[PDB]
Design a binder for these strands. Structure first.
Ligand SMILES: [Mg+2]
Ligand SMILES: [Mg+2]
Ligand SMILES: [Mg+2]
Ligand SMILES: [Mg+2]
Ligand SMILES: [Mg+2]
Ligand SMILES: [Mg+2]
Ligand SMILES: [Mg+2]
Ligand SMILES: [Mg+2]
Ligand SMILES: [Mg+2]
Ligand SMILES: [Mg+2]
Ligand SMILES: [Mg+2]
Ligand SMILES: [Mg+2]
Ligand SMILES: [Mg+2]
Ligand SMILES: [Mg+2]
Ligand SMILES: [Mg+2]
Ligand SMILES: [Mg+2]
Ligand SMILES: [Mg+2]
Ligand SMILES: [Mg+2]
Ligand SMILES: [Mg+2]
Ligand SMILES: [Mg+2]
Lengths: 142, 187, 258
RNA sequence: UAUCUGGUUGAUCCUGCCAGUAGUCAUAUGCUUGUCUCAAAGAUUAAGCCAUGCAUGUCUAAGUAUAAGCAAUUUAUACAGUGAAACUGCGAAUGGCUCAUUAAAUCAGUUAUCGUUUAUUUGAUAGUUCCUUUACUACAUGGUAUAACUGUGGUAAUUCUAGAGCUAAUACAUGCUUAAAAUCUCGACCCUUUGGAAGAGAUGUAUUUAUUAGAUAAAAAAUCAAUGUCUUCGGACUCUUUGAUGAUUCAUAAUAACUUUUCGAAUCGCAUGGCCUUGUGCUGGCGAUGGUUCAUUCAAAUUUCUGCCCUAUCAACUUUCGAUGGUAGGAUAGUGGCCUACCAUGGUUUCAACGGGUAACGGGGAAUAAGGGUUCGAUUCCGGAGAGGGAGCCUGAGAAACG
RNA sequence: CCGGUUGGCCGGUCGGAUUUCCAACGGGGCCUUUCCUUCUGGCUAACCUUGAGCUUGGCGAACCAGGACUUUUACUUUGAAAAAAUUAGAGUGUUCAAAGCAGGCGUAUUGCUCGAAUAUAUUAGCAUGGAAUAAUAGAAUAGGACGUUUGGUUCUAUUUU
RNA sequence: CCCGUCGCUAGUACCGAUUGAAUGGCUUAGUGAGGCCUCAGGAUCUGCUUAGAGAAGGGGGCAACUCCAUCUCAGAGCGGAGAAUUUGGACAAACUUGGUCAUUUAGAGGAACUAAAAGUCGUAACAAGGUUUCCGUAGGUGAACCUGCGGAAGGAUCAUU
């Protein structure tokens, strides 16, 4: 959020070409889409300047499959957070339950700002990395 | 040989996996192309389901597109000047995708003369009507036209030579040209 | 492993074929065709186990090679050709015409039809798209591709297919008050009118359905096949008419006729 | 089918174990053994080692036949019946066997491919190639081989094959023959503004890259910059096109090029008609095989959620040699540290990570149970893995294949 | 107020059931301070209407469609999608039975015909009704809810001139 | 009321000084087969471009001179397919020299425990067991055990307004 152009390659959206001949307002062509399933595309994606190839709104991924909910327990990666899904597991012999949990690494777009303690909902995508298969679609706590 | 699987790596917890399975063929990997310049030499690779794949080794020319002008010409490649993954590819003159190269630029100047009638750098009535009608589009940019004086244009390789065999690209323009120009002129 | 399987053990075959668990280790594996191998009926089990016109697979092959049976008007001298839902089967010796429709017990019925009715079949459209050179097409439930369809035909409709040509005679849309056939699931074989459909964006649209005795049920949209408006169907329904009497009413009805 | 009983004392009541008692698709063993039906069967120890034989080959009217094969003709001096070999094409990746490995692995139920390959089947689907396009030619049809065969041989020996002489194709290499119109791009020249053309070239599909479209919640006015086939030249300006999905840069279309240039039938069997200015003229049926692309089917490869035995006399593990993520590339059928270059310092864990053990393939399931449970599941079905141990690969749609 | 099941009722045929009926159990509609949200259209559902008692001109789920605002769970009900075999179980004299999925009935010559049910199958995922019991959130240096206001910044964007 | 030392027989595990050999998972350094990709290489085979030179047959001579020629010598060429061999690379079986751990054997000797045993010396406990017993800790002793210090009653005292 201090520069866009940090890497050695030119960061740009693929096949979105801004014609150097013309001169208008609305400075650059920015491609964005709605991810579907009633998730609202955030204004920071529509108006921003970040590139973020793995974004569910401006980038080349699609949300399909499970929609999950967790609480952010780690933000120390770059564009990646770890959420914690807590559930109760039933044991039939003793006729009662026990607390269990899983950690899910999810990708977070620069449209969203999360801290530790926020509740997020994530949507399944194709494999992003070795462990990441989920992508943040709405941050709605603090 | 080269395997493309994830069972040989550690788990996310960090444990060492046991050998579940011998290396399967549907997860194979193949050696790189390392496409050099000159004297075109295309080998074939038989891949999954038939479905031939063209390893270009040592490609010479390419089809390069001028995007603001909406054309494309078959132009000779001079050499790679920048690569964001590795400097040894720039030194060894390997052609991959996203390689910044220099191309010949003489078909582009021939098209620009034949289309607009003004020369870059420094007879019939029908051609006069055509050249007058598309006026106020013969002022392209400063950076590209100075390259046209120098006879070498900066292009970016958009094709994958080890996969298709072809080395296609587009001429660098605008802010992307300024970015790679600051990269190139950086000491 | 290592490639496609070519055998099919008995006790792995679909249960609605009614193949007895003794008399052989293998079942007739349906060859690749217009229908999925679970929701299909090979001609060997139709000719031998349902019509009793043969005693062996060898006799079924002997029937098939003299080009007697033809399915949807084409000859098909294959032993394990998958005949599926709404296929017509013509036996020109005996001049017989069958349509594969389910009885309410969930099995394929021996539904004898007349010669006028054997001239067509219904198909549920599975996708409408634009092929090459911008030509639209539909794909019916048995994989027939029909070019230049009507623009009003969207998915989950039924089109009437001519079976001498591959042309479309007319079509039934999808809304409330339409007579449906359930092909798939627990309620396989039942006929009822659709009351309403549930949007469920993200997977598995449900549809609520009530038969003539006002018994409602619900089914996924994958298993529903619209067959007309309420009152007239576009085909002849088998005996029973898809009513699903309970077992109490069924032994009462059996003790009537016994 | 909700059951107990004998044994500590000189006697008693208890704790408590031992012993009995019933079953076992639990094995073994002893003694005994008439009949009918039905039936498991080298799992446990040694996924130890193997003499012998067999277990994968295949032909139709419909790829190739001059067997110096066999038949009988009488259609037929080119062939035409049956049929060895051999070439070509498919198949040999299924089945069958076993349970060593393997503890978030396999597996089970439930998802996804908007992240990909798919022989076959089934349904659709290809007037564009005379590559310099007045013949440079074959399109009433073009070139080589080579096998079997014939003959000469080598080696102790093998499903070893060498030199020589023949000859085919639905093998291998090569190559043409069909409507038009329409639209773009160059344009001789008539001319000049209001400008027109005659002509030539290009436009199938596949490959690759760049660019463009793929829209859309409901109504009126203002100078203006060019106005728009006719204009009351201030018009009514509509009628001007737009499929799907929850969602796409999707389907599909267009433009400019690319290609080392993919495919676009030199194939086979029966029937042998139709119409003629009567030439061996033009035309025409039902098939068979092949073929590009899409869909379908049989599949595959990855993948989401949750669920696994004992052990802390295992408390910290992973990370120069990828450990967790970012950016580019490479490779792959495709996604991804899958690999490389550079960068950041992450990722798991008392809710038991990591290690160790398993006389551990997982599941459907089995035995025994009032209810709750406990023990087992090598083994008739489903999934996985392996072929003495490892590793590597060819062919092919499909193998890291073991007949 | 209203219908839903089990009754109950002249035992109507001498163990069959026409409901004016007592009763119990289980739902729904409305009012009582009771918001248990509704921005655009066709269609009007009830419906203003209404013909002398089938008429021409009122409230959108009554029927859908389009977008917009959504405290978050655990629990329980119903249902979908859960492979056969095996388990429980229905029918059927394998001569009985273990089994099997067969079979039965005629003028047995042209034949006719009933079947191959059903239930269970956890935990997880999915759709749905309930909202007791356990949690969770909210208006407190108001930054609160409203709002026909009275306005100003700022962003699209149609049909039109 | 049959056991504390010492003693006999049998069995079971432990510690073993022992620089003994045998396995195996890893691991340190050095080599590293094979195929595959790649840089070359070019045995051979073949197709077309010249036509100088060498035996017979047409158009002028019907007497050196101009076109096809059966075939080579080959140079004024362009290729193509391609075998051995060979360079780098990734994959990587294996090999040699260590070093760790998970497994066996031998083993001078110990060191206990259990059972069975008509042994030896005492009498520690059970009665106020003849010095009440037991606990923790320290020292001592042929053996039970003894003694110091603090504790307990499971004591031989529920008790002295
Ligand atoms: Mg078959
Ligand atoms: Mg005692
Ligand atoms: Mg006694
Ligand atoms: Mg006992
Ligand atoms: Mg198999
Ligand atoms: Mg086809
Ligand atoms: Mg990548
Ligand atoms: Mg990366
Ligand atoms: Mg094992
Ligand atoms: Mg075993
Ligand atoms: Mg198996
Ligand atoms: Mg295998
Ligand atoms: Mg063996
Ligand atoms: Mg092998
Ligand atoms: Mg074998
Ligand atoms: Mg004594
Ligand atoms: Mg004493
Ligand atoms: Mg004493
Ligand atoms: Mg004493
Ligand atoms: Mg005492």
């Amino acid at each position: 959020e201090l520069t866009v152009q940090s890497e050695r390659a030119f960061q740009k959206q693929p096949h979105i070409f801004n014609n150097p001949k013309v001169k208008t307002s609305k400075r650059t062509k920015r491609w964005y889409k709605n991810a579907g399933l009633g998730f609202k595309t955030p204004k920071t994606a529509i108006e921003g300047s970040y590139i973020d190839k793995k974004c569910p709104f401006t980038g080349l991924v699609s949300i399909r499959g499970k929609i999950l909910t967790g609480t952010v327990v780690s933000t120390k990666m770059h564009r990646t957070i770890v959420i914690r899904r807590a559930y109760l597991h039933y044991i039939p012999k003793y006729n009662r339950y026990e607390k269990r949990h899983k950690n899910v690494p999810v990708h977070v777009s620069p449209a969203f700002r999360v801290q530790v303690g926020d509740i997020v909902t994530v949507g399944q995508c194709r494999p992003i990395s070795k462990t990441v298969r989920f992508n943040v679609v709405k941050v709605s706590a603090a | 040989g080269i395997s493309r699987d994830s069972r040989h790596k550690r788990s996310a917890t960090g444990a060492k996996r046991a050998q579940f399975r011998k290396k399967r063929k549907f997860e194979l990997g193949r050696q790189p192309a390392n496409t050099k310049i000159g004297a075109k030499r295309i080998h074939s690779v038989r891949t999954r389901g038939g479905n031939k794949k063209y390893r270009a080794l040592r490609i010479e020319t390419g089809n390069f597109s001028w995007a603001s002008e909406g054309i494309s010409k078959k132009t000779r490649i001079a050499g790679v000047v920048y690569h964001p993954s590795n400097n040894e590819l720039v030194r060894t003159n390997t052609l991959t995708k996203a390689a910044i190269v220099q191309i010949d630029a003489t078909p582009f100047r021939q098209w620009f003369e034949a289309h607009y009638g003004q020369t870059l750098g420094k007879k019939s009535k029908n051609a006069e009507r055509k050249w007058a009608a598309r006026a106020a589009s013969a002022k392209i940019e400063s950076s590209v036209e100075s390259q046209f004086s120098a006879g070498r244009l900066y292009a970016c390789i958009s094709s994958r030579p080890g996969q298709s065999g072809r080395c296609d690209g587009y001429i660098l323009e605008g802010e992307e040209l300024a970015f790679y120009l600051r990269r190139l002129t950086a000491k | 492993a290592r490639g496609p399987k070519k055998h099919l053990k008995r006790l792995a075959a679909p249960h609605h074929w009614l193949l007895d668990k003794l008399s052989g280790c293998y079942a007739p594996r349906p060859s690749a065709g217009p229908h999925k191998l679970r929701e299909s009926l090979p001609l060997i089990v139709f000719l031998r186990n349902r019509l009793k016109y043969a005693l062996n697979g060898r006799e079924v092959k002997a029937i098939l090679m003299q080009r007697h049976v033809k399915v949807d008007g084409k000859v098909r001298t294959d032993t394990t050709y998958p005949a599926g839902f709404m296929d017509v089967i013509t036996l020109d010796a005996t001049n017989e015409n069958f349509r594969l429709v389910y009885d309410v017990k969930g099995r394929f019925a021996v539904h004898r039809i007349t010669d006028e009715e054997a001239s067509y079949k219904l198909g549920k459209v599975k996708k409408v798209q634009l092929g090459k050179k911008g030509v639209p097409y539909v794909v019916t439930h048995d994989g027939r591709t029909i070019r230049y369809p009507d623009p009003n035909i969207k998915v989950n409709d039924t089109v009437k297919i001519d079976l001498a040509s591959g042309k479309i005679t007319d079509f039934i849309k999808f809304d409330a008050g339409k007579l449906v056939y359930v092909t798939g699931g627990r309620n396989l074989g039942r006929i009822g009118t659709i009351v309403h459909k549930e949007r469920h964006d993200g997977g598995f649209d449900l549809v609520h359905i009530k038969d003539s005795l006002d018994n409602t049920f619900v089914t996924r949209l994958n298993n529903v096949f619209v067959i007309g408006e309420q009152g007239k169907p576009y085909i002849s329904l088998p005996k029973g008419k898809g009513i699903k009497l309970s077992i109490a009413e069924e032994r009462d009805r059996r003790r009537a006729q016994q």
